[PDB]
Amino acid sequence: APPEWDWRSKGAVTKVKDQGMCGSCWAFSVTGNVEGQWFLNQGTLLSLSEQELLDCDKMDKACMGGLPSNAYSAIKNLGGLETEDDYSYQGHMQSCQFSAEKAKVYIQDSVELSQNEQKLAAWLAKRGPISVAINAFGMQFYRHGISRPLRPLCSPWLIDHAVLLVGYGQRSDVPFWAIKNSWGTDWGEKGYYYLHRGSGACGVNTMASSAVVD
Amino acid sequence: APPEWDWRSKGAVTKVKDQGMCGSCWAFSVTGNVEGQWFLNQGTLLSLSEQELLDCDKMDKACMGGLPSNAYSAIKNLGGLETEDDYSYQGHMQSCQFSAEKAKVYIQDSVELSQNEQKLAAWLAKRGPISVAINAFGMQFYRHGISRPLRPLCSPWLIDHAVLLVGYGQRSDVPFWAIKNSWGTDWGEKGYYYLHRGSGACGVNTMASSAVVD
Numbered sequence: 001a002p003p004e005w006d007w008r009s010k011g012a013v014t015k016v017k018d019q020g021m022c023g024s025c026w027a028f029s030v031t032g033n034v035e036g037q038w039f040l041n042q043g044t045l046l047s048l049s050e051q052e053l054l055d056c057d058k059m060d061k062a063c064m065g066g067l068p069s070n071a072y073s074a075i076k077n078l079g080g081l082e083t084e085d086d087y088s089y090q091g092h093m094q095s096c097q098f099s100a101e102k103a104k105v106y107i108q109d110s111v112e113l114s115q116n117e118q119k120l121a122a123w124l125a126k127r128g129p130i131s132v133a134i135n136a137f138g139m140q141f142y143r144h145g146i147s148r149p150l151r152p153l154c155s156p157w158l159i160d161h162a163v164l165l166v167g168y169g170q171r172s173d174v175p176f177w178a179i180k181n182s183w184g185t186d187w188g189e190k191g192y193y194y195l196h197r198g199s200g201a202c203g204v205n206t207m208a209s210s211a212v213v214d
Numbered sequence: 215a216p217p218e219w220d221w222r223s224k225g226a227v228t229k230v231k232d233q234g235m236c237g238s239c240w241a242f243s244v245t246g247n248v249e250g251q252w253f254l255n256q257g258t259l260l261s262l263s264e265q266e267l268l269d270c271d272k273m274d275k276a277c278m279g280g281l282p283s284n285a286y287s288a289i290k291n292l293g294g295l296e297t298e299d300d301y302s303y304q305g306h307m308q309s310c311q312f313s314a315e316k317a318k319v320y321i322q323d324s325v326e327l328s329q330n331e332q333k334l335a336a337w338l339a340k341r342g343p344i345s346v347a348i349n350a351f352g353m354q355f356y357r358h359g360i361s362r363p364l365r366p367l368c369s370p371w372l373i374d375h376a377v378l379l380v381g382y383g384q385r386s387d388v389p390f391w392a393i394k395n396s397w398g399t400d401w402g403e404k405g406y407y408y409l410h411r412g413s414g415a416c417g418v419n420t421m422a423s424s425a426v427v428d
């Protein structure tokens with residue numbers, strides 16, 4: 001695997017979005033991963049609908065939380081995912097407005113990735129952005145820099161956020177993961193969270209996954 | 215046994231893989247079975263190395279064919295199976311790169327199952343995906359739907375392929391076996407072959423087996 005890699009300059013990542021006051025992080029983690037997979041496997045980067053997951057996925061609970069695993073399944077079962085433009089984000093659940101004929105992206109499966117961060121970096125560089133669940137301890141008071149919270153304070157037992165691994169590298173010889181958040185661009189480093197890489201920081205390596213598009 | 219059952223929605227099946235131009239079907243049939251056994255008995259689904267079998271299993275012949283029975287014996291003798299991440303698939307034989315400390319999965323033995331399809335269904339629903347040898351005639355032209363070639367075209371005595379039973383059920387009162395193939399996802403129904411169940415179709419029930427984990 002390469003020493004460093006980031007998908008933003010390669011066209012596999014959409015701009016940073018904002019979930020607002022809705023606890024829909026899980027939906028953004030999933031669309032971000034699916035957007036990357038569709039670009040790399042079908043050739044076009046599209047901004048996909050988180051709202052479809054909020055309204056047409058009852059296994060998950062919209063603003064009250066969800067799991068990428070259930071999201072991938074819902075998208076497959078529904079028959080596709082619409083774009084942000086055809087099904088805009090409202091920040092709250094509503095009756096399902098999914099239209100099989102409006103869907104432009106399809107999922108056929110999903111995979112759970114390795115818990116080894118070296119292997120995760122290799123997968124990322126070769127197959128695209130990875131959906132990950134993390135403990136958000138080191139994010140609220142976050143501004144910039146490579147975050148490395150006191151280990152016990154960011155354990156995998158309290159994972160409570162879902163985001164996206166977009167790249168990795170080293171800043172002054174300190175390994176990092178470039179993580180796309182969903183709280184707008186005015187947060188952190190242009191909407192991104194940089195986390196220490198190689199220490200199982202905030203359980204970032206424990207629940208990595210990706211959809212398998214058609 | 216349940217009227218229907220499929221391990222895909224239950225987390226015991228990895229993504230559909232692709233042999234490439236290599237007669238390594240036997241290796242995929244075996245890793246698929248072991249992946250299911252380790253998930254059910256140890257709790258985690260890991261994508262395992264078919265390459266290990268191509269390079270380290272000397273009773274079999276890598277891209278020119280193999281027997282599930284030989285493969286189970288090799289895995290046991292080697293001391294386990296490494297993951298796809300640690301020992302990636304190349305589609306051709308190489309020198310053995312197996313390393314004891316890299317082994318993440320191990321088996322204690324293997325069993326040959328009954329040819330009775332009702333018993334096989336019951337065993338599948340209770341113990342997991344089953345490795346099966348099959349006459350691949352019906353798969354050569356397969357597009358979709360429940361395959362049921364004429365007897366003389368799919369003789370149960372002309373076995374040439376090895377796949378994995380992942381589920382069973384019925385489509386319009388027609389009983390079927392859901393079979394995971396290893397020719398990529400563009401083949402068949404998203405990489406899967408659906409075969410008539412209850413008629414010993416293509417000898418699918420004649421060489422059923424499974425690794426024993428625990």
Ligand SMILES: CCC[C@@H](/C=C/S(=O)(=O)c1ccccc1)NC(=O)[C@H](Cc1ccccc1)NC(=O)N1CCC(N2CCOCC2)CC1
Nearest residue numbers: 022023024025026063064065066067133136159160161162
């Ligand atoms: C209120 C839900 C917020 C939302 C997004 C985080 S957020 O809104 O940006 C945020 C972060 C930090 C402080 C406040 C708000 N969180 C989630 O969707 C998280 C994401 C997640 C967590 C763990 C593993 C994988 C994914 N999931 C959820 O919160 N879920 C609700 C509980 C559910 N549990 C299932 C088992 O039985 C108990 C309930 C799982 C999904």
Ligand SMILES: CCC[C@@H](/C=C/S(=O)(=O)c1ccccc1)NC(=O)[C@H](Cc1ccccc1)NC(=O)N1CCC(N2CCOCC2)CC1
Nearest residue numbers: 236237238239240277278279280281347350373374375376
């Ligand atoms: C060139 C080998 C291809 C490979 C995988 C099939 S394949 O690549 O998907 C494909 C599909 C359709 C047409 C051609 C090729 N096949 C095998 O490994 C097959 C799988 C198999 C066959 C028979 C019983 C059990 C398992 N094995 C073999 O081809 N082997 C050679 C013959 C040997 N004898 C068979 C008869 O009894 C004594 C031993 C068994 C192993």
